[PDB]
Amino acid sequence: DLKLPRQKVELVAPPFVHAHEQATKQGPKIVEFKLTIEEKKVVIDEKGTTFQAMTFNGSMPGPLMVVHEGDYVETTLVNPATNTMPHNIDFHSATGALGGGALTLINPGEQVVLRWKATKTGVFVYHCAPGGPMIPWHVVSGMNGAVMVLPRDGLNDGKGHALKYDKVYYVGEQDMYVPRDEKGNFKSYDSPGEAFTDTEEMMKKLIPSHVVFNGKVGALTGKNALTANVGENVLIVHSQANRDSRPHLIGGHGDYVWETGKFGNAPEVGLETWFIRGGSAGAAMYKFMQPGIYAYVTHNLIEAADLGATAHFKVEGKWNDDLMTQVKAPAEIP
Amino acid sequence: DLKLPRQKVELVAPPFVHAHEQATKQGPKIVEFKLTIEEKKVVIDEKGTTFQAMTFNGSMPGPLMVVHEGDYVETTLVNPATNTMPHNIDFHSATGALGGGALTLINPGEQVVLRWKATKTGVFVYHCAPGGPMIPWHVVSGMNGAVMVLPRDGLNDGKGHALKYDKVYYVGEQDMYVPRDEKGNFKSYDSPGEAFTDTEEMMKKLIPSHVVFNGKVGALTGKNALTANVGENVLIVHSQANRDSRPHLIGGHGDYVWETGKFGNAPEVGLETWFIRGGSAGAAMYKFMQPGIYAYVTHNLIEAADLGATAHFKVEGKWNDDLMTQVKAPAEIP
Amino acid sequence: DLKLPRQKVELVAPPFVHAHEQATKQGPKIVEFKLTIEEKKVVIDEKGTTFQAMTFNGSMPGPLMVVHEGDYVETTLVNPATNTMPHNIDFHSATGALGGGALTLINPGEQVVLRWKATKTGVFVYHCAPGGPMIPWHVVSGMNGAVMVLPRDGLNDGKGHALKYDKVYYVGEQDMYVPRDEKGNFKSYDSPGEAFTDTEEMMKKLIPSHVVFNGKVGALTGKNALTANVGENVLIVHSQANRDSRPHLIGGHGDYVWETGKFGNAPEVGLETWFIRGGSAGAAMYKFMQPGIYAYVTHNLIEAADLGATAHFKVEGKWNDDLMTQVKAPAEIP
């Protein structure tokens, strides 16, 4: 019945974001996405700890989907027969049927096609939610991502002025619960099912073993640091499907921040640290002013430095001595 | 000295809310409430775990009190001789004397009458606070509720438009700390006093055993699911007197949300998940658009699914295929 | 190159704040501060528990620095040879070089001079951040404080009206991690280095042993209670460099609150409880209306009453029976 043009999107793995328009002259379309579920054992830290992950499209987080207000988002969710568990998808951006979860439960070997109208603007979590205790377990195993629903006129500052980003990154934060043996080493498991009992026991104690960005300690560092140049306005979408976070750009700010993540609200300005409620996505824009290394963290510094939740930006450009300068280098106290 | 009309309220148990006006032509009144404290052993989960509760009016949470700005709230607090402990009441809505706590300490067999002027609008916690370590213990044993102070012109959107709810529910969330024995089973105690040492030891470790709505796992499900019809605007007041929460309506949104809970501030719009600071009440309005089951959770999904913090709505009406549709039911992958 | 007038500040220990102007006719200056690092063993509770602290200027928190928008803040950071560790300073108010940390690493026996331009208004954390796992450890050992960057026109309500405070207090909240021995007593250590292994093991479990204001249980009580008179507008700056908090003034309100702490945003009004994200400072103003004792807490009441996080105000003036009155003192139930 719905006679609108169809547009396919080629999703890309986080922290990158598929190409899209901010402000657009397009009217509503049916925007087509495919997500293929993958259960897989992965390495989550530099010590070689393994983890029974379950993912949309092979990544933690799942990829960012980007549409505009009033689009219809038509997702083909695929659960190949090489997986062991049923799965589904719930979009916090969608209205009805538990966000879609009640319409998308698929066994291994099945696929389903869900469409929802993007009536709410902002960034939103999506996640698997099979039912009952499986809900938290699938989410904390990695089955969560986000979708961005942009206004057709692009983003604004709440005072009539356009905010336009030069690039966007998606940082998905994952709380992980890896049990330890008697002597204190992390355990490894042969299947998600085998990991479940120990993993649920730990989950209910509410303390993660690892808190990571992009699926792994150090994922967004080194060759895979985020990048910018002085003068570029960067949008950083941050999601956390299960547990609170407090993002902070070390050496920078949130120039414009939607911590509750919803573009019908004006951004806050000039923040040091913002707050992502567990079960949500938020977004912050910053115009880089100084070159060099930045760390992007959750500002529980124990989780940042010790449990995995640090990304880097490497920023090119000219140092601004007006903004900051080392007046006297380290020297012996007189 | 205060020569204003008096109005009695018949309180009703949560999640229901006593009848009241939103916008009103009444001027200030003395609104009379009675709260009778009850210490009692209750069952908190479907396994039969027991808990030494202490309550206002027999319920967790205590009942919602509703008045208007500039009313005087006159509460008769009763501590029958069948209780074992002193108790008092502190209203976060009130000014002075530790919210009233310093004027309301009553031993078993006593009652006291406190009046406070409702000079601040919003939803607010009330709770017992005897002194010292008894403060957290009485609160986490159940001795907390909330009061709503409405503007005389009713609620507004911050842009000049009335928001009127068709019904209101009060969801009180309770963090509970039930110790376990050596073999791992929850303990039972003969009195609140007998429970105290083990319970305080656990409390100080900051991890609840249970996180429940309306006093029990599953309280707001089944016959006691919350209800609505498509087209109804529902206000959901959420309180948490001791510990943060992140409410979320699965399949819906917060159309208008006061997460800090205070009507002198405009609501935020179109939220997925909001945040109730421990020690506060907040409120969210949603106009239902789709029929069916919704879950209302804290979106730490471990606490929602595994520790008790899930309510349901059952919503009647016509399915809207424009907003969401199952384009293709589950089928074998081609 | 920077040819502006220089002004020295004499810092004062928290919770007091060095003298400053709110609205000012001064233009930009170079405002000079000195911070001298002190590692020291201190007592943190009334039981005599000790703690290996590391501090700016000898205090937890470090002292509040106050400047105006567009000032240049020139800090001489001194690490005397009587300390054991390298240290640095990162200002969340500053732009570049990890907030200054990348320009200020100093060994014992060294000092360094950093200048940054105060381009963002609000209250902000500063803290040590040497690198890697040392970052959280130095912060949770006490090496954090805050800086306030005021608009040159002073504070406003977002509706065109000046807010002027009669006094300001700085409450620095510290999460502390003191390990216990087998029999359950807190451990004591001979040096910060000796404390590190046990302390890091505990840190990674994310549960503090103590949560204190001004460095110690009960620091802001008794002779050192905070004070006010009825009619005085008091600004309370609250910081937490590592972990969330939920401030609340028991018996009062936050009349005007910047919980994210940044003066480019309007305050919220009439709050019961607000939220300080770990890694940030926020601020609340209240005009006292009633005399007597108030408690200022984090409203996780377990942390407030049992882990250390309670301050008092003692307020002088006349009781207002219109706002609150004890209609009937405790009496036998009829």
Ligand SMILES: OC[C@H]1O[C@](O)(CO)[C@@H](O)[C@@H]1O
């Ligand atoms: O940026 C979004 C905000 O901007 C406005 O459209 C103009 O102030 C508001 O109505 C909205 O909340």
Ligand SMILES: OC[C@H]1O[C@](O)(CO)[C@@H](O)[C@@H]1O
């Ligand atoms: O809804 C409450 C809000 O609405 C207004 O009255 C009009 O914008 C504001 O002054 C207030 O903060």
Ligand SMILES: OC[C@H]1O[C@](O)(CO)[C@@H](O)[C@@H]1O
């Ligand atoms: O108080 C700060 C706020 O006040 C205003 O200047 C006037 O409403 C806003 O532009 C700013 O966000």
Ligand SMILES: [Cu+2]
């Ligand atoms: Cu799944």
Ligand SMILES: [Cu+2]
């Ligand atoms: Cu969800």
Ligand SMILES: [Cu+2]
């Ligand atoms: Cu009590």
Ligand SMILES: [Cu+2]
């Ligand atoms: Cu309280």
Ligand SMILES: [Cu+2]
């Ligand atoms: Cu240091």
Ligand SMILES: [Cu+2]
């Ligand atoms: Cu920092």
